[PDB]
Amino acid sequence: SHMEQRILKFLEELGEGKATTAHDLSGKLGTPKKEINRVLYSLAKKGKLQKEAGTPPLWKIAV
Amino acid sequence: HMEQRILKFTTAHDLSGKLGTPKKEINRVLYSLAKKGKLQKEAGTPPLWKIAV
Amino acid sequence: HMEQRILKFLEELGEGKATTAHDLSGKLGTPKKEINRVLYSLAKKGKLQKEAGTPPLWKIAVSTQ
Amino acid sequence: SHMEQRILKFLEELGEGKATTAHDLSGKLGTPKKEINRVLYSLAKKGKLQKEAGTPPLWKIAVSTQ
DNA sequence: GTCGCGCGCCATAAACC
DNA sequence: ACGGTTTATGGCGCGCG
């Protein structure tokens, strides 16, 4: 929920309909993709984030 | 719709009758929900459950 | 080699009906890790189609043209 | 079942207070990770091994319980 | 009768930079 | 005498009869 917050913050910042990727997040936060992804996927089951299947997947805030 | 009802309503095996749902499906929404911080798993055999206030 | 086995096995099942990687793992006498490894490789090669689920169901790839 | 014996042996031959992952046991023992974990988890219930929390879990020969 | 399991995941090939 | 490092649905925690 700290790093969940780093990520959520960043998404909300970066546009209001925008998406992004684990690789993008990882750069803009000096964090291994593994970590970013650990949290992105957690957040998704929690209903918080919305994921668009793809190579790589695209992540945006949900309702 | 399950997540919703699961809330309004103990064991998963015991949840299969009250809502008429296969145990698999209940254990799914349980472990998920406790991962959402809302529920909380007790160590029984089988495991027991209760809404974390 | 293991691929054409799975395919061959997905022929003798009647068009429409699908199967799981556990099921295959038994029938074909092969560890599930290898089965799935190959299954996911055939779907991506086009030969097969994956119907994501719990567990996922696998059948011959169906043209959508 | 000489799998238990082989793993306990490997975890002993690794050193004092030292741990390792099941992926690693499967590698060296040349044994499917499926069986390795089935067994690892088994030895932990029997009390012989302890499972350190992690991703993945780390294992080592127990040192506390009776 | 615990069990939620979706798992292929690299003893990797290809792709990036 | 030389392409090192990251990706992939790569998140994996899995042991399940």
UniProtKB/Swiss-Prot annotation, chain C:
Residues 3-65 are annotated as: Interaction with Z-DNA. Disulfide bonds: none annotated. Signal peptide: none annotated. Induction: Isoform 1 is induced by interferon alpha. Isoform 5 is constitutively expressed. Homodimer. Homodimerization is essential for its catalytic activity. Isoform 5 can form heterodimers with ADARB1/ADAR2. Isoform 1 interacts with ILF2/NF45 and ILF3/NF90. Binding to ILF3/NF90 up-regulates ILF3-mediated gene expression. Isoform 1 and isoform 5 (via DRBM 3 domain) interact with TNPO1. Isoform 5 (via DRBM domains) interacts with XPO5. Isoform 1 and isoform 5 can interact with EIF2AK2/PKR and UPF1. Catalyzes the hydrolytic deamination of adenosine to inosine in double-stranded RNA (dsRNA) referred to as A-to-I RNA editing. It is linked to Dyschromatosis symmetrica hereditaria: An autosomal dominant pigmentary genodermatosis characterized by a mixture of hyperpigmented and hypopigmented macules distributed on the face and the dorsal parts of the hands and feet, that appear in infancy or early childhood. This is Double-stranded RNA-specific adenosine deaminase. It comes from Homo sapiens. The lineage of its organism: Eukaryota, Metazoa, Chordata, Craniata, Vertebrata.
